[PDB]
Amino acid sequence: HMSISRFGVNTENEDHLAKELEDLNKWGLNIFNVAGYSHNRPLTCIMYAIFQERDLLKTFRISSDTFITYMMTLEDHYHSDVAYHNSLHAADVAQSTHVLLSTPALDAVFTDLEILAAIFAAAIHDVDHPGVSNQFLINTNSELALMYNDESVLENHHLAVGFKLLQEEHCDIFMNLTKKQRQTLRKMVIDMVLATDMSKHMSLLADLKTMVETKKVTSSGVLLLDNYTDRIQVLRNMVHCADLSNPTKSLELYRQWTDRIMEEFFQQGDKERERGMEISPMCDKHTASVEKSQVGFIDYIVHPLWETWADLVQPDAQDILDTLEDNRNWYQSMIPQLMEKFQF
Ligand SMILES: O=C(O)Cc1ccc(Nc2nc(-c3cccc(Cl)c3)nc(C3CC3)n2)cc1
Ligand SMILES: [Mg+2]
Ligand code: NA
Ligand SMILES: [Zn+2]
């Protein structure tokens, strides 16, 4: 029971886990190892480590036992057999969001409640993901698309599941928040998860560009944000950036993530084919070109996003940008010798 107290998870390798978690505050954390040494409970482990590191459990009076119970059922509601959108991906976005919240240009800009909302949003943002895209769910007239009227169908679902889990007995981690804190937290979390809908990517990016065009900083380089509206706009872009962070990690990590997203796409493609539908872009293992698509993904989606975020917080994200360019160069080099999914 002491290593649960220390880690929030059972582990046969306490020492290895602890050494991996020394990188908790770094972009170079290896979440695959964390999964390895945590009996495959990366989200519970990384969330417990994050909440301990930021004193969130103290500040908001969240019982660590109730937290672990909530995080274990949340993590169970991610599907192990979905190749990318499983609890490892959620863990990674939560850890990446945790690192982005400490970027020096944002120092002291956000409230504690904002910090809590963003990390919690990251943790729940893909829960109960079925391994197929919104468009597939819309095209197959699925119950989820009927329920949510084709609008941010999975994202609404992730939120509903995340919040419904809080009403299970013994799982309400926010019980000691005041009513006003619970209301505010709820609104911010909804906002941020809905912002992870890829079809909002271009509108988010445009808004973010306006914020770069108008940015002002103190003479120490800290961003000056005027009101709630400015801050939530940065936080929704932050979570969106963390969700699209895989190509800004070390190549060894990025390649693992790409193998996973492609397996997931190919599995959807097989579903589409089994039922005689036209196979979606990227989902046909026969015609796919993994390297070229990554290069396209970076050039048209990931790079423009991160170049703008980098402009907003400069110079704090320059290295993340350098890695993203370097990785683009690697994928480009391995080519043998999209856009509608991110718009409307
Ligand atoms: O599947 C969707 O409809 C929305 C979506 C799009 C992209 C992602 N993530 C992702 N998407 C791609 C990707 C690559 C090429 C084309 C397209 Cl549409 C997406 N590549 C990667 C690499 C970083 C691991 N990740 C997740 C969800
Ligand atoms: Mg999602
Ligand atoms: Na599960
Ligand atoms: Zn995600």
Swiss-Prot record:
<protein>
    <recommendedName>
        <fullName>3',5'-cyclic-AMP phosphodiesterase 4B</fullName>
    </recommendedName>
</protein>
<feature type="binding site">
    <location>
        <position position="89"/>
    </location>
    <ligand>
        <name>AMP</name>
    </ligand>
</feature>
<feature type="binding site">
    <location>
        <position position="126"/>
    </location>
    <ligand>
        <name>Zn(2+) 1</name>
    </ligand>
</feature>
<feature type="binding site">
    <location>
        <position position="243"/>
    </location>
    <ligand>
        <name>AMP</name>
    </ligand>
</feature>
<feature type="binding site">
    <location>
        <position position="297"/>
    </location>
    <ligand>
        <name>3',5'-cyclic AMP</name>
    </ligand>
</feature>
<feature type="binding site">
    <location>
        <position position="294"/>
    </location>
    <ligand>
        <name>AMP</name>
    </ligand>
</feature>
<feature type="domain" description="PDEase">
    <location>
        <begin position="9"/>
        <end position="337"/>
    </location>
</feature>
<feature type="binding site">
    <location>
        <position position="294"/>
    </location>
    <ligand>
        <name>3',5'-cyclic AMP</name>
    </ligand>
</feature>
<feature type="binding site">
    <location>
        <position position="85"/>
    </location>
    <ligand>
        <name>3',5'-cyclic AMP</name>
    </ligand>
</feature>
<feature type="active site" description="Proton donor">
    <location>
        <position position="85"/>
    </location>
</feature>
<comment type="function">
    <text>Hydrolyzes the second messenger cAMP, which is a key regulator of many important physiological processes. May be involved in mediating central nervous system effects of therapeutic agents ranging from antidepressants to antiasthmatic and anti-inflammatory agents.</text>
</comment>
<feature type="binding site">
    <location>
        <position position="126"/>
    </location>
    <ligand>
        <name>Mg(2+)</name>
    </ligand>
</feature>
<feature type="binding site">
    <location>
        <position position="243"/>
    </location>
    <ligand>
        <name>Zn(2+) 1</name>
    </ligand>
</feature>
<feature type="binding site">
    <location>
        <position position="297"/>
    </location>
    <ligand>
        <name>AMP</name>
    </ligand>
</feature>
<comment type="similarity">
    <text>Belongs to the cyclic nucleotide phosphodiesterase family. PDE4 subfamily.</text>
</comment>
<feature type="binding site">
    <location>
        <position position="126"/>
    </location>
    <ligand>
        <name>AMP</name>
    </ligand>
</feature>
<feature type="binding site">
    <location>
        <position position="85"/>
    </location>
    <ligand>
        <name>AMP</name>
    </ligand>
</feature>
<feature type="binding site">
    <location>
        <position position="126"/>
    </location>
    <ligand>
        <name>Zn(2+) 2</name>
    </ligand>
</feature>
<feature type="binding site">
    <location>
        <position position="89"/>
    </location>
    <ligand>
        <name>Zn(2+) 1</name>
    </ligand>
</feature>
<feature type="binding site">
    <location>
        <position position="126"/>
    </location>
    <ligand>
        <name>Mn(2+)</name>
    </ligand>
</feature>
<feature type="binding site">
    <location>
        <position position="125"/>
    </location>
    <ligand>
        <name>Zn(2+) 1</name>
    </ligand>
</feature>
